[PDB]
């Protein structure tokens, strides 16, 4: 329990600060280990609550210990910031943000399960942020109590876990950092049980046996790990696991560290009441008061806590091995900074200079109980932030030259983020983690605060990171729509990996990284964010209505008056041309002459036809056209607007089942009008044109980039799944992993992410973006063909009659 | 650490896996931050 003054004083000696987090696969004990750290060294102040985001720890080392720290130290006190990290491990950007504000990591690995993919994923991301790792092989009690494992087997298991870890490290760690691998002999590996309160380092045992073996601990800790044997018969230390006679020698680690522990367990758990007092006396363990009466596990738990207190082992690795900000910002500056490496701000970052201009990185916005207010969480890399300070808020798109994302505003309050609570403070210098209140509106997710007009903006790991799983969301009670629209905004702001947008069909879409992620999101959206009954359903797939050939015969339709008639034919527009229209080469507003020269000279069109396009559709710019091919119609100019309008209507709502048309060309062959404009009016010709178009359409034989990264041996699953889903491989490139690119029909992608991990042993990672439209060859009017099934399902879903009206329904015989 | 510094709030196991979902699955789902 410290006062604000004590805290602030502790924060001045950044050489004695440690910003870190705990990396662990679900169920490996990340929580119980931090509870242990908090109970042993947690810090607390001597009615606004927040979600616990970080916890402060306090630790003191002995004068000798502090001498061993291979980095700038000022005194024997240390302040440790245990920063919370998300639990979603899909190589998400929310995780990268959290790691970005840390410099070291305590990696938890299970004794039995060893290193699992989740573990490798966060560690890999961590290494990408140049974070230094330290390991704790947890759940050791399971191997002794449940599995009855032997000493050499336990050893071997430990050694294999350590090797698996240094494979990931040696693979992803920047060579500039040197050897960031972990070594039990160097004290960067702890072993223990977070559930039971005991742990140790070789160092602690070396200290214990050094002054006893008549040898300095530097020599002792090298001998207490690996292939070091002490032959009691010769009284000598060797590196051979056998003696001259060839008899088996027990490894020093097993003989001096494990055996005492093994004997304590065996004696206490078997109630050997005449063997326990001696063993405890020899190890100098003292039971006091009611403890003298304990037996079994109760006695064990109590005896091991006294013999080798857990928190102590962990704090030792944290203080002695994890880096303090001064050391790290020196080699992290350039990555962290987008600007010039020679820039005044970059240098201030390298020096962790508190007197320079401000360079504060906003890691994320954290939920508070202050009625819908989110506090900004981040780290001061340069300068010092102060309450009521005028600063420059620069979003993700800000550039020193433009005024985009820029927001100048005073910072209302600077708060210490201590777990679920906050503590207003006046200032905070470079090198520290901190929370800012009042930045809510201007920043959502990451950002960059500066006090320099020149200041440039700041930058991200082997879980899914793409919003491939999506559903349509809608309120059960129409009147709730406002809360839903608002809830989505709240949801988006709180989750970096969540996506929401409005579909072409007018549905609110919410997409998540994986099925589970999407589920949490929908639960939170419905219960909190929007707090209203929501209805969830598939996303509806949009289709296009086109023609495969020219009208088998002239389409003829008359107006309601029966006085006007339009004669036309429909024909396919080439894909390259549709694409050209959709992408900007052929435009609705371009000069008809130059456009026609292009369509004719470059796309094979007849220049007269091109010069005579009357309009594009739908919406006046779609990839469908009306070309005038009439010769001597007197009042043509007067019906043009009606014809154009009817086309916008026809191409917007196709006759197959109401989807928009695409790649449809309509040629007006002839028009017969009544002499009097009365009764030639839009109300007469618009229906005629739309009716004729639908008829020409139906008479023209109507019809309606998935990138995967993964290991070689897994690629086979990709082809396996794709073939089961009308997929098609596009490219197989590459000494990282492989990347297979393929086309996957959208209506074959629901659940794809699941079938893929299942076929690749969870090693493949998909990515999908809409690429193109593809024409289904089957008959849209045949309820049993592939296209027809889709058409029948949409028709029923919209309450239309099942049978698709045929062309005869729009043809008016002469 | 709270034995050495009064200024550390202790958080117990159930204060960290405190969410109703976490309780329901018996795992951690959300990242927690402690000090
Ligand atoms: N025997 C024993 N059990 C322990 C020890 N540390 C933790 N446990 C037990 O192991 C189980 C899991 O611990 P927990 O901390 O929740 O694991 P986790 O790694 O945080 N979980 P998840 O991966 O879901 O986050 C608990 O029942 C806990 O009591 C230990 O030192 N010894």
Tab-separated table of N, CA, C and O and ligand atoms in Angstrom, chain A residues 24-33 108 118 138-142 145-146 192-198, chain B residues 13 17 26-28, ligand 1:
chain	number	residue	atom	x	y	z
A	24	UNK	N	-0.030	-16.894	-22.074
A	24	UNK	CA	-0.418	-18.260	-21.759
A	24	UNK	C	-1.630	-18.750	-22.538
A	24	UNK	O	-2.557	-17.987	-22.827
A	25	UNK	N	-1.598	-20.037	-22.875
A	25	UNK	CA	-2.679	-20.706	-23.587
A	25	UNK	C	-3.778	-20.890	-22.532
A	25	UNK	O	-3.471	-21.045	-21.343
A	26	UNK	N	-5.046	-20.857	-22.949
A	26	UNK	CA	-6.161	-21.023	-22.005
A	26	UNK	C	-5.968	-22.222	-21.086
A	26	UNK	O	-5.488	-23.270	-21.511
A	27	UNK	N	-6.338	-22.050	-19.821
A	27	UNK	CA	-6.233	-23.111	-18.824
A	27	UNK	C	-4.829	-23.457	-18.341
A	27	UNK	O	-4.671	-24.337	-17.487
A	28	UNK	N	-3.807	-22.795	-18.874
A	28	UNK	CA	-2.462	-23.100	-18.419
A	28	UNK	C	-2.115	-22.442	-17.089
A	28	UNK	O	-1.007	-22.612	-16.588
A	29	UNK	N	-3.063	-21.703	-16.517
A	29	UNK	CA	-2.833	-21.087	-15.222
A	29	UNK	C	-2.400	-19.638	-15.176
A	29	UNK	O	-1.845	-19.191	-14.175
A	30	UNK	N	-2.648	-18.898	-16.248
A	30	UNK	CA	-2.281	-17.489	-16.302
A	30	UNK	C	-2.915	-16.691	-15.162
A	30	UNK	O	-2.258	-15.866	-14.530
A	31	UNK	N	-4.183	-16.956	-14.886
A	31	UNK	CA	-4.895	-16.249	-13.829
A	31	UNK	C	-4.394	-16.516	-12.419
A	31	UNK	O	-4.136	-15.571	-11.671
A	32	UNK	N	-4.261	-17.788	-12.045
A	32	UNK	CA	-3.814	-18.111	-10.690
A	32	UNK	C	-2.382	-17.665	-10.445
A	32	UNK	O	-1.996	-17.416	-9.304
A	33	UNK	N	-1.586	-17.566	-11.502
A	33	UNK	CA	-0.219	-17.098	-11.327
A	33	UNK	C	-0.213	-15.602	-11.024
A	33	UNK	O	0.539	-15.150	-10.164
A	108	UNK	N	3.908	-18.633	-19.841
A	108	UNK	CA	3.507	-19.811	-19.080
A	108	UNK	C	3.337	-21.017	-19.989
A	108	UNK	O	2.643	-20.959	-21.001
A	118	UNK	N	-1.573	-21.721	-29.336
A	118	UNK	CA	-1.984	-20.449	-28.746
A	118	UNK	C	-0.771	-19.757	-28.133
A	118	UNK	O	-0.592	-18.546	-28.261
A	138	UNK	N	4.561	-24.448	-15.719
A	138	UNK	CA	3.514	-24.537	-14.696
A	138	UNK	C	2.849	-25.916	-14.532
A	138	UNK	O	3.121	-26.845	-15.302
A	139	UNK	N	1.980	-26.043	-13.525
A	139	UNK	CA	1.264	-27.295	-13.275
A	139	UNK	C	2.182	-28.480	-12.989
A	139	UNK	O	1.824	-29.619	-13.286
A	140	UNK	N	3.359	-28.228	-12.425
A	140	UNK	CA	4.292	-29.310	-12.130
A	140	UNK	C	3.696	-30.340	-11.170
A	140	UNK	O	4.021	-31.524	-11.238
A	141	UNK	N	2.817	-29.881	-10.283
A	141	UNK	CA	2.183	-30.749	-9.293
A	141	UNK	C	1.430	-31.917	-9.932
A	141	UNK	O	1.319	-32.986	-9.336
A	142	UNK	N	0.913	-31.707	-11.141
A	142	UNK	CA	0.187	-32.748	-11.852
A	142	UNK	C	1.085	-33.944	-12.155
A	142	UNK	O	0.672	-35.095	-12.013
A	145	UNK	N	1.757	-35.721	-8.574
A	145	UNK	CA	0.581	-36.328	-7.954
A	145	UNK	C	-0.233	-37.268	-8.838
A	145	UNK	O	-0.518	-38.393	-8.443
A	146	UNK	N	-0.608	-36.811	-10.025
A	146	UNK	CA	-1.400	-37.628	-10.941
A	146	UNK	C	-0.592	-38.675	-11.704
A	146	UNK	O	-0.792	-39.872	-11.509
A	192	UNK	N	7.180	-24.842	-11.481
A	192	UNK	CA	6.355	-24.838	-10.285
A	192	UNK	C	4.889	-25.159	-10.452
A	192	UNK	O	4.479	-25.779	-11.435
A	193	UNK	N	4.105	-24.721	-9.471
A	193	UNK	CA	2.663	-24.929	-9.445
A	193	UNK	C	1.968	-23.655	-8.966
A	193	UNK	O	2.016	-23.303	-7.783
A	194	UNK	N	1.328	-22.959	-9.892
A	194	UNK	CA	0.640	-21.735	-9.542
A	194	UNK	C	-0.517	-21.954	-8.593
A	194	UNK	O	-0.866	-21.058	-7.823
A	195	UNK	N	-1.115	-23.140	-8.641
A	195	UNK	CA	-2.247	-23.466	-7.779
A	195	UNK	C	-1.815	-23.738	-6.345
A	195	UNK	O	-2.477	-23.305	-5.406
A	196	UNK	N	-0.717	-24.472	-6.176
A	196	UNK	CA	-0.218	-24.786	-4.848
A	196	UNK	C	0.634	-23.656	-4.272
A	196	UNK	O	0.949	-23.646	-3.080
A	197	UNK	N	1.727	-22.292	-4.392
A	197	UNK	CA	2.524	-21.173	-3.930
A	197	UNK	C	4.025	-21.356	-3.814
A	197	UNK	O	4.660	-20.672	-2.999
A	198	UNK	N	4.605	-22.260	-4.603
A	198	UNK	CA	6.052	-22.459	-4.554
A	198	UNK	C	6.661	-22.522	-5.945
A	198	UNK	O	6.024	-22.989	-6.892
B	13	UNK	N	-8.340	-15.038	-7.574
B	13	UNK	CA	-8.638	-15.779	-8.778
B	13	UNK	C	-9.983	-15.361	-9.376
B	13	UNK	O	-10.091	-15.161	-10.593
B	17	UNK	N	-11.157	-13.915	-13.424
B	17	UNK	CA	-12.196	-14.599	-14.216
B	17	UNK	C	-13.548	-14.270	-13.584
B	17	UNK	O	-14.136	-15.098	-12.876
B	26	UNK	N	-15.733	-21.855	-17.448
B	26	UNK	CA	-14.655	-22.222	-16.550
B	26	UNK	C	-13.267	-21.950	-17.103
B	26	UNK	O	-12.293	-22.584	-16.696
B	27	UNK	N	-13.163	-20.938	-17.959
B	27	UNK	CA	-11.888	-20.511	-18.521
B	27	UNK	C	-11.827	-18.987	-18.515
B	27	UNK	O	-12.807	-18.318	-18.194
B	28	UNK	N	-10.665	-18.446	-18.858
B	28	UNK	CA	-10.515	-17.034	-19.175
B	28	UNK	C	-10.907	-16.815	-20.612
B	28	UNK	O	-10.513	-17.570	-21.491
C	1	LIG	N1	-1.856	-28.709	-8.732
C	1	LIG	C1	-1.835	-27.426	-9.086
C	1	LIG	N2	-2.882	-26.878	-9.697
C	1	LIG	C2	-2.656	-25.588	-10.056
C	1	LIG	C3	-1.544	-24.837	-9.867
C	1	LIG	N3	-1.700	-23.568	-10.421
C	1	LIG	C4	-2.920	-23.638	-10.884
C	1	LIG	N4	-3.541	-24.820	-10.692
C	1	LIG	C5	-4.865	-25.317	-11.005
C	1	LIG	O1	-5.057	-25.509	-12.390
C	1	LIG	C6	-6.318	-25.111	-12.833
C	1	LIG	C7	-6.156	-23.968	-13.840
C	1	LIG	O2	-5.581	-22.776	-13.282
C	1	LIG	P1	-5.903	-21.469	-14.104
C	1	LIG	O3	-5.132	-20.486	-13.363
C	1	LIG	O4	-7.336	-21.109	-14.069
C	1	LIG	O5	-5.449	-21.735	-15.550
C	1	LIG	P2	-5.330	-20.813	-16.802
C	1	LIG	O6	-4.016	-21.068	-17.356
C	1	LIG	O7	-5.422	-19.436	-16.111
C	1	LIG	N5	-6.544	-20.832	-17.776
C	1	LIG	P3	-7.035	-20.562	-19.242
C	1	LIG	O8	-5.999	-21.054	-20.241
C	1	LIG	O9	-8.461	-20.913	-19.441
C	1	LIG	O10	-6.692	-19.089	-19.025
C	1	LIG	C8	-6.940	-24.631	-11.572
C	1	LIG	O11	-7.819	-25.623	-11.091
C	1	LIG	C9	-5.834	-24.367	-10.613
C	1	LIG	O12	-6.266	-24.631	-9.273
C	1	LIG	C10	-0.451	-25.422	-9.201
C	1	LIG	O13	0.592	-24.875	-8.872
C	1	LIG	N6	-0.673	-26.746	-8.838
